């Protein structure tokens, strides 16, 4: 039993084989080197190499061709898969059949559009995928297009200071099964400032208090350990009836997943 990865994550017992990938993908091979053990390795501080790994895994394991810039966040695939499988568990996906269409929202989808591409590819899930950043929007839209998934994934550029509520008016589906979200990167006064991550997820909580049963589950993936406790307390204060959380990692890269619901 793994403590780092979701039980159904394909990389849980089959980690990426860099020698295999280098043998097959010349664009990947040019970014690898040999370590002191004589093993094929990669410099994870180098964005070109990290990009090549992500693009290569998506191609090899998921049949997805993506194009992304060096100047925006490059996602790490094994880590992201944990969140997809966790959402599967939240919504009861393992125990239903294909006749049930699911509808998600990815808040701040990124240049990769990685959550919608994985969810649409693996499960046939629909996504509304929002993005404030122009470059990320443009890339996301092309990545969905080039993988022929625009009937499942609607990529939408949204204004700088809007979130879930603004995205879901008369245009919307009646009920969504979930939202997902990776938050964006961010001796005198005793009180610590909330910081970017806590503030951002509190905005989602605030929107959920309006939308209530229009989404079955609200979720986020947290990058700061210190986020989880205050967000649980804010959900308690507001009387949110169903709260669940879990923890994943990939090596030293740790994440805390938090989800809540107004259903019984
Ligand atoms: Na494969």
Author numbering: 3 to 188, 214 to 291
Q: What do the authors report?
A:
In this work, we present the structural analysis of human METTL16 based on two X-ray crystal structures of the N-terminal MTase domain (residues 1–291) of human METTL16 (METTL16_291): an apo form at 1.9 Å resolution and a post-catalytic complex with S-adenosylhomocysteine (SAH) at 2.1 Å resolution. To provide structural insights into the methyltransferase reaction catalyzed by the MTase domain of METTL16, we solved X-ray crystal structures of apo and SAH-bound METTL16_291 (METTL16_291/SAH). These structures confirmed that METTL16 is a Class I SAM-MTase that uses a conserved Rossmann fold to bind the SAH product and likely SAM, the methyl-donor substrate. The conserved SAM-MTase core (residues 79–288) of METTL16_291 possesses a mostly parallel, seven-stranded β sheet (β1–β7) organized as ‘3214576’, with β7 being antiparallel. Although the MTase domain of METTL16 has a canonical Class I MTase structure, METTL16_291 has several unique structural regions: residues 1–78 that precede the Rossmann fold as well as residues 95–97 (ηZ) and 188–222 (a putative loop containing disordered residues 188–214) within the Rossmann fold.
Structural comparisons of apo and SAH-bound METTL16_291 structures revealed that the cofactor-binding site in the apo structure is occupied by four water molecules, which serve as placeholders for the following heteroatoms: (i) amino and carboxyl groups of the homocysteine moiety, (ii) 3′-hydroxyl of the ribose moiety and (iii) N1 of adenine. The β sheet appears to be stabilized by a disulfide bridge between C183 and C247, thereby linking the β4 and β5 strands. This disulfide bridge is present at approximately 40% occupancy in the apo structure and is absent in the SAH-bound complex, likely because of radiation damage and/or the presence of Tris(2-carboxyethyl)phosphine hydrochloride (TCEP) in the protein buffer. Comparison of the apo METTL16_291, SAH-bound METTL16_291, and SAH-bound METTL16_40–291 structures revealed significantly different orientations of the 184NPPFF188 motif. Additionally, the 184NPPF187 residues are adjacent to a disordered region spanning 189–213 in the apo structure and 188–214 in the SAH-bound complex; these residues could not be modeled due to a lack of electron density. This disordered segment is one of the elements that distinguishes the Rossmann fold of METTL16 from other SAM-MTases. Hence, it may play an important role in RNA substrate recognition and/or orienting molecules for catalysis.
